[PDB]
Structure 1
Amino acid sequence: MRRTHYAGSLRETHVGEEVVLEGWVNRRRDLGGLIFLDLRDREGLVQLVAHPASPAYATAERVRPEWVVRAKGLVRLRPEPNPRLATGRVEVELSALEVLAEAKTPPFPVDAGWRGEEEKEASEELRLKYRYLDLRRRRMQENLRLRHRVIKAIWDFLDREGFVQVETPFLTKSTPEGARDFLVPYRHEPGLFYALPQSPQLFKQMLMVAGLDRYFQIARCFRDEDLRADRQPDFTQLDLEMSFVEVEDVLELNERLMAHVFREALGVELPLPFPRLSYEEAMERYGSDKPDLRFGLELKEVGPLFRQSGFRVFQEAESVKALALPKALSRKEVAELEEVAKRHKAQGLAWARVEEGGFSGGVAKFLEPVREALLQATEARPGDTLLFVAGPRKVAATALGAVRLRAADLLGLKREGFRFLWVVDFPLLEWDEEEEAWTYMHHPFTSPHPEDLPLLEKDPGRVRALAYDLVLNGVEVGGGSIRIHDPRLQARVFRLLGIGEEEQREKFGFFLEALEYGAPPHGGIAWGLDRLLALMTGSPSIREVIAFPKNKEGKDPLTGAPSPVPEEQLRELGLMVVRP
């Protein structure tokens, strides 16, 4: 019974051996008094040959796709090799064939991928309703095995660096603010509920208070958000925390971990260290806090070059950002880019073509008086097209930032490879507008920069935080920060945020007390593992790297779960349905 080899493992070196294989029939071909069966298992395909003189011929004649069988035979060299199958040089002459399970016709084909051919994927609702058949496809199994390899690589590296894996609670306390929590009724007392964790944040910080120098966990997180932007009700994160560290210790450890993961999983060598850009530098050069560095097209400030002369729009604005495109755009291409600029509420997009010794179209006449100085600042050459956005420094950068991205598509620029970078020095507080007090941009426990400590009172506007974001190809894959370990500083901060000393004792009471027993300096980070895997695989959605995901409504077509429960089961919990 026991198989001798995986079907897709057979090679020219097995010629002459007697083998026993078990798997699925990928395809059957009757070539006239000769039946060929392509047997499949996780490692690949192998051609089986049944001749009329073989005792297995009768059974080979009744087999259909997806039937599970056990085959016995002699491995022999193929009269003609198939250059695209790892087992292409051999075939198995059958001596026996037995059916272990029959199968009805699948709603969609799963055989093409295994031949190296392109597949026609069925609608996603069908794939999800029959996920166990979708998971038989080569590409899906490659994604799941890659996810295994990545997590194993993470364990090998962190175990080697002294990190202790700690499992955190799933039934915790609900919090009045943040994101909406998923709740769990406490049977023994109506009105009491557990909440599923949005993140292990407080627990990993308490593990640092406990003296576990360094921790990690592949943690499942749950957030009941009105998400349609390709997000799942629950997702996976690599969670990590360390003690007695400064920002640089965290970044260096993560760069080395990430290079290890890519080397082991994809066999790709990443250059270290990763570039590091401050929030301000990223906004000015790329118009975004999550820059895509796979192409250039850097933004240039040219506002100074315009106030000595005089072109209305270009001077009432404190900033004039320019972008030099290596192509002569058409009127339709310009109009499309202008739409993008306006979406990010910018009054308009100005343009001009760069010809030999002069400009053409758009605002060309206003550029001639500064031609020389402009060509240097922008480094534009004949044939290029200049685009401008004038207005508030933040609006101009953000708007042109969006144009730069859309421009990469129209021009069909080559965006390949993996470009990682750290964005650091973010501000501590967010846009609280003009009525009253500020709010946090990261999380209440994020440490403000030490040298900026004093400014915390007189000008909390430009006080930076010790926070960092990890971005890959224009996408945020992770983020973290150095935490506040001083109970008094935490308060001083809570003074600014305007959170009452009665509200703190309600939403963070147990944690604030922990800080009074000697908390060491500490900090960490969390990676969106599903998102990282989707980018590593070039998948269009994180649903391609999760075995059994939910659809866009948060429902599960396979199990039909969000389902009704017996009225008495709810009554047992002391609950009744109403409206919402």
Structure 2
Amino acid sequence: GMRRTHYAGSLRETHVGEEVVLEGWVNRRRDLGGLIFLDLRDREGLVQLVAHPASPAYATAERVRPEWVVRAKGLVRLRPEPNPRLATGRVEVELSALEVLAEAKTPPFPVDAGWRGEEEKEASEELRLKYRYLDLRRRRMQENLRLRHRVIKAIWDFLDREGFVQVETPFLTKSTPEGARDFLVPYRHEPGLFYALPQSPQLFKQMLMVAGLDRYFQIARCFRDEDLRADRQPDFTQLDLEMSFVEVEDVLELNERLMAHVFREALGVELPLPFPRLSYEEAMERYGSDKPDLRFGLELKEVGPLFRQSGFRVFQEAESVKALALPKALSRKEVAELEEVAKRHKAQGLAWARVEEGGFSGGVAKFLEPVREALLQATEARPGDTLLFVAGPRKVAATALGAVRLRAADLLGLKREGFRFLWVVDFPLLEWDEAWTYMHHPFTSPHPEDLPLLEKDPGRVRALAYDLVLNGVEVGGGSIRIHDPRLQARVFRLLGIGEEEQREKFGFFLEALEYGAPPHGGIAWGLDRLLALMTGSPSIREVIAFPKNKEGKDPLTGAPSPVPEEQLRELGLMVV
């Protein structure tokens, strides 16, 4: 069997009197009063080893250095005084034996402090990625990775109970000139032919519904050669799922219970069900964003129809006027800060006014007095508040003041805590291109109520699509799919997408619909983004074991790197 009797960090007072054998890394050494104290570290935490002058281990204990790997043997004793910052804090190990298994160079950054419950100084992320195997020794990184394990196991447990079948889908598949750019893989035996990495399992998982598997899931790797962001890697992980014979309601309710199960089991957090839902239109109107942050209020209010008889032409003639009431008298600097946030979001400007006991003061206060009663009933502003207004096209005014609202939260120091999920539903199927564009993929079903509006009034057609939002971040997205090939053809005909282009991009899938596809729909979570939010991480790199840096490269291995020209000649390709 194993030589170690316990994980080092698992020793408690219940083990006093036992002889133990431990293996781990030297976190830190301390010489105090002729005793040698060694913090022994493994993944379950630190335990204090003590070498006494009489002990056979005494000389060895004096020469060991941080990060050396050792095997220790001794007796579990109570500490004279416990250290409550360690779960092993009541006990220590009186060393009888100490053996060196590997020496270690001094690491380029410290990894010992987190294991003592001390704050850790921020290190260069580029240095952390270069020595990622050392960065992953830190307690916070192991907690992230172990939480990610617990989340995926919880997903498996739940979806297996609900009758879902995990199916693994191809990584080498068809290159399509649609969507984001594909990562390509050269096919050695016929130069000029390429596989592509999958942007998502979408077509495969729909084909699994055509195959009658009823319900599917996969922890799926997705590859998109696009520009990067703090929650955006060249390859990332989705929880991908698809069900048959469902309506929007069935997909949402399943995902709510799954998410509640995940948070309960992996974080010990209780999520109230059901999640709140807002139409896309409601979200834009009340928050100015299709991914609202519900951790604070400060909703936007449409006050356009209060100023149709006003002398203030910029309010009076505007298509929309959005108002926001902040519970604090702002600095003129702060107002100008918010004005700049509004202008950066296409707004013509940001009007403002202070609310007093009997009226308004400053900014556009003069033009607000005539409608004071209605303006206060619509905004519910109180004496002391600041009123912020953006006037213009309806979508511009909403989005500008929604960004202003987000910035206002920071400038007011609002405590934003917990996990606030919501569904955004009833997205528009289409959007005009300065033609007609869709959101994500063209297999999203139109609302059956809106079918006649496809050709008569396309911009008003609702899709059966939904986004899952957590604390103002898009953690998931899906839809009910088109399963009638005659309706899919009708959507393509409306999109101007010719039959030759359909067969080139989607021919094998469109043929599949001719053999009886069931009603079906699904979703994919951004699993890295969820875990980042679950851990309060500033970037999804904190929840990926070996990510790329924010520039798409890997400082650890050096990829991407050149290859010998003989390796590239074998593929029949050459650098231009």
Q: TM-score, normalised by structure 1?
A: 0.98
The structural deviation recorded for 1:442 is: 3.0
Residue number in structure 1 paired with 2:491: 493
CA deviations 1:243-270 (Å, max 9, x no partner) are 0000000000000000000000100000
The structural deviation recorded for 1:84 is: 1.2
Which deviates more, 543-552 or 220-229?
Answer: 220-229
Structure 1 runs (4+) deviating above 4 angstroms are none
The structural deviation recorded for 1:389 is: 0.9
Residues of 2 paired with 1:192 and 1:269: CA distance?
Answer: 51
Residues of 1 paired with 2:211 and 2:308: CA distance?
Answer: 60
Q: How does 1:353-364 map to 2 (within 5 A)?
A: 353-364=354-365
Residues of 1 paired with 2:374 and 2:203: CA distance?
Answer: 55
Residues of 1 paired with 2:97 and 2:228: CA distance?
Answer: 54
Note the aligned Cα RMSD (angstroms). Answer: 1.0
Matched-pair contact (CA < 8 Å) for 1:15–1:75? yes
CA deviations 1:424-478 (Å, max 9, x no partner) are 001111222xxx9312123110000001001111111201000000000000000
Q: How does 1:91-106 map to 2 (within 5 A)?
A: 91-106=92-107
| Structure-2 change in CA distance of 1:410 and 1:232 (3 Å) | same
Which deviates more, 216-225 or 299-308?
Answer: 299-308
The structural deviation recorded for 1:32 is: 3.1
In structure 1, list runs of 5 or more residues that go unmatched.
none
Residues of 2 paired with 1:499 and 1:567: CA distance?
Answer: 42
The structural deviation recorded for 1:121 is: 2.8
Residues of 2 paired with 1:336 and 1:121: CA distance?
Answer: 29
Which deviates more, 386-395 or 291-300?
Answer: 386-395
Residue number in structure 2 paired with 1:562: 560
CA deviations 1:523-560 (Å, max 9, x no partner) are 00000000000000000111000001111221111111
Residues of 1 paired with 2:26 and 2:230: CA distance?
Answer: 39
The structural deviation recorded for 1:83 is: 1.4
Matched-pair contact (CA < 8 Å) for 2:295–2:471? yes
Residue number in structure 2 paired with 1:120: 121
Residue number in structure 1 paired with 2:466: 468
CA deviations 1:154-195 (Å, max 9, x no partner) are 000000000000000000010011110000111111111100
Residues of 1 paired with 2:263 and 2:165: CA distance?
Answer: 22
In structure 2, list runs of 5 or more residues that go unmatched.
none
Residue number in structure 2 paired with 1:234: 235
The structural deviation recorded for 1:365 is: 1.1
Matched-pair contact (CA < 8 Å) for 2:48–2:93? yes
The structural deviation recorded for 1:503 is: 1.2
The structural deviation recorded for 1:271 is: 0.5
Matched-pair contact (CA < 8 Å) for 2:351–2:390? yes
Which deviates more, 505-514 or 244-253?
Answer: 505-514
Partner secondary structure for residue 502 of structure 1: helix
Residue number in structure 1 paired with 2:226: 225
The structural deviation recorded for 1:230 is: 4.2
Matched-pair contact (CA < 8 Å) for 2:422–2:469? yes
Percent of aligned positions that are identical: 100
Partner secondary structure for residue 436 of structure 2: coil
Partner secondary structure for residue 216 of structure 1: strand
Matched-pair contact (CA < 8 Å) for 1:428–1:442? no
Which deviates more, 163-172 or 75-84?
Answer: 75-84
Residues of 2 paired with 1:507 and 1:305: CA distance?
Answer: 51
The structural deviation recorded for 1:27 is: 0.6
Residue number in structure 2 paired with 1:444: 442
Residues of 2 paired with 1:567 and 1:556: CA distance?
Answer: 22
Matched-pair contact (CA < 8 Å) for 1:437–1:496? no
The structural deviation recorded for 1:309 is: 3.5
| Structure-2 change in CA distance of 1:303 and 1:423 (3 Å) | same
CA deviations 1:286-340 (Å, max 9, x no partner) are 0110000000001111111112342211111021111110000111000000001
Residues of 2 paired with 1:428 and 1:540: CA distance?
Answer: 33
Residues of 2 paired with 1:555 and 1:323: CA distance?
Answer: 43
Matched-pair contact (CA < 8 Å) for 2:183–2:225? yes
Partner secondary structure for residue 61 of structure 1: helix
Q: TM-score, normalised by structure 2?
A: 0.99
Matched-pair contact (CA < 8 Å) for 1:468–1:480? yes
Which deviates more, 545-554 or 531-540?
Answer: 545-554
| Structure-2 change in CA distance of 1:144 and 1:229 (3 Å) | closer
Partner secondary structure for residue 407 of structure 1: helix
The structural deviation recorded for 1:147 is: 0.3
Matched-pair contact (CA < 8 Å) for 2:234–2:552? yes
Partner secondary structure for residue 28 of structure 1: strand
Matched-pair contact (CA < 8 Å) for 2:308–2:317? no
Matched-pair contact (CA < 8 Å) for 2:303–2:321? yes
2:554 aligned with 1:574: no
Partner secondary structure for residue 500 of structure 2: coil
CA deviations 1:117-159 (Å, max 9, x no partner) are 0111320111111111100000000000000000000000000
CA deviations 1:356-412 (Å, max 9, x no partner) are 111111111111111111111110110111111111111111111110000000000
Matched-pair contact (CA < 8 Å) for 1:110–1:134? yes
Which deviates more, 199-208 or 116-125?
Answer: 116-125
Residues of 1 paired with 2:34 and 2:302: CA distance?
Answer: 77
Residues of 1 paired with 2:97 and 2:457: CA distance?
Answer: 83
Residues of 2 paired with 1:125 and 1:229: CA distance?
Answer: 14
Matched-pair contact (CA < 8 Å) for 1:230–1:552? no
Which deviates more, 218-227 or 254-263?
Answer: 218-227
The structural deviation recorded for 1:229 is: 4.8
Partner secondary structure for residue 103 of structure 1: coil
Residues of 2 paired with 1:41 and 1:568: CA distance?
Answer: 45
The structural deviation recorded for 1:562 is: 0.8
